[PDB]
Ligand binder design. Structure first.
Ligand SMILES: CCCCCCCCCCO[C@@H]1O[C@H](CO)[C@@H](O[C@H]2O[C@H](CO)[C@@H](O)[C@H](O)[C@H]2O)[C@H](O)[C@H]1O
Ligand SMILES: CCCCCCCCCCO[C@@H]1O[C@H](CO)[C@@H](O[C@H]2O[C@H](CO)[C@@H](O)[C@H](O)[C@H]2O)[C@H](O)[C@H]1O
Ligand SMILES: CCCCCCCCCCO[C@@H]1O[C@H](CO)[C@@H](O[C@H]2O[C@H](CO)[C@@H](O)[C@H](O)[C@H]2O)[C@H](O)[C@H]1O
Ligand SMILES: [Br-]
Ligand SMILES: [Br-]
Ligand SMILES: [F-]
Ligand SMILES: [F-]
Ligand code: NA
Lengths: 96, 125, 125, 96
């Protein structure tokens, strides 16, 4: 009954080629977060990287100016029933 | 065979209790799942009471002793779930709550075993 | 919940029976740290570690099987309560050096078997 | 199959009113040894005291000179099968 998806994903600071994102930790043991991003126009390879379970912010670099990006975060988390498993993503869009 | 049924019957009751308690309560406080802790503390209290009580009743059927200890306390408590909870906290970089879980489970179980033992010991005296 | 209940009772009985058989054969061989109680805690730590990495890569496994391997087998196989009285008995026997050794070998050793179980399947996959 | 009964019970030193006894610990976890002693002849009250499980010697005092004494030792030990229980006794006779 306890959601393992992060909440309140948002860009808190932005340059034309980078984004500072942050989110609220879910109420479970998160081993690490996985951040996905890519150009919204489904004509670009999506990239993924991890940040430790203790962090709740991440910098996305190497972006293009004035381009629409889709950014998602999900968790690799421990729970009693499922041991390690991946949560559904939370997703936002942001134009640099 | 009669001993096998004591372990299976006692273990099934202990495992069933641990499964129900852990699911209902572990998610309430994931830094130290209280369902896994409570089954370990309760199994210690029982095994401590059983330690003192069985000492003074030497004519008790070994069927009852084996069902309450190797059976119930064995199915009820767990070291494996305790393990993955600490392992998961260690991989999550939450070192302080990994150590705390180790201390609370070990120190806390030995105390409940003492309580079960001395309460029965003080009562018979 | 009834199908889930059968998963707990079946795997738990196999774990409890395994723990009861291994303990009665090997514990008296070395009373300062009974190796049967250790081996079932190490083994359950190993299995739960492999289960940790394997279940992560097989997210569509029937919860019936995941419940029978962890809460059932590992839960019934491992034990915290018998580990408690062994340390309690050593403390009451004034054998502190082996009470502390028993506490360390079980805790440090179960986590390592959990790590070994996790990292082996992770390196394989 | 491991005996919890002590072996090689013997008096190592004596005075007219006292006895220093020693034994070999059994291959179990003894919590304490029980030492009982009484006058071998007829109906004299057997007395008993406990010795911690780490010790394997004990002093018996307040005896009468030139009297036959029966001394027995047994353990309160822990085992997996029986939790806390008592072993059978090992017994010797000694005349002060
Ligand atoms: C008492 C001993 C018991 C037996 C040994 C148990 C060992 C348990 C932890 C091992 O697992 C590793 O732990 C690292 C530390 O949590 C993780 O680092 C991850 O998180 C760190 C957080 O600071 C980052 O710095 C790392 O780059 C990142 O890989 C890493 O992924 C993980 O595989
Ligand atoms: C850090 C977590 C702690 C959790 C709780 C631990 C509980 C420990 C219980 C210890 O039990 C006592 O141990 C004493 C020491 O072994 C015994 O003394 C007996 O044995 C001693 C050692 O030989 C002698 O010095 C004493 O005189 C003799 O009474 C005593 O009978 C016994 O009840
Ligand atoms: C976190 C808490 C840590 C501390 C826990 C408590 C430790 C101190 C206990 C004090 O009371 C003890 O009670 C024992 C009985 O329960 C007595 O054992 C006496 O009687 C026992 C048998 O009942 C024998 O085994 C013992 O050797 C003999 O000393 C012992 O003398 C006495 O001092
Ligand atoms: Br047990
Ligand atoms: Br478990
Ligand atoms: F374990
Ligand atoms: F316990
Ligand atoms: Na168990």
């Amino acid at each position: 009954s306890v959601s393992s998806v992060p909440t309140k994903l948002e860009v808190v600071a932005a340059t034309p080629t980078s984004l500072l994102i942050s989110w609220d930790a879910p109420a479970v043991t998160v081993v690490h977060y996985v951040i996905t991003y890519g150009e919204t126009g489904g004509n670009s390879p999506v990239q993924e990287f991890t940040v430790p379970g203790s962090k709740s912010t991440a910098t996305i670099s190497g972006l293009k100016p004035g381009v629409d990006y889709t950014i998602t975060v999900y968790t690799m988390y421990y729970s009693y029933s499922d041991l390690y498993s991946y949560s559904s993503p939370i997703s936002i869009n942001y134009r640099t | 065979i009669k001993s096998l049924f004591a372990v299976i019957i006692g273990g099934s009751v202990g495992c069933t209790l641990r499964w129900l308690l852990s699911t209902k309560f572990n998610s309430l406080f994931p830094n130290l799942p209280p369902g896994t802790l409570v089954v370990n503390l309760l199994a210690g209290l029982i095994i401590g009471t059983a330690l003192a009580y069985f000492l003074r009743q030497p004519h008790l059927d070994p069927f009852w002793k084996l069902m309450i200890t190797t059976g119930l306390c064995g199915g009820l408590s767990t070291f494996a779930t305790f393990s993955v909870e600490v392992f998961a906290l260690l991989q999550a970089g939450n070192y302080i709550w990994a150590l705390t879980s180790v201390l609370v489970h070990v120190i806390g179980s030995l105390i409940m075993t003492a309580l079960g033992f001395f309460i029965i010991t003080i009562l018979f005296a």
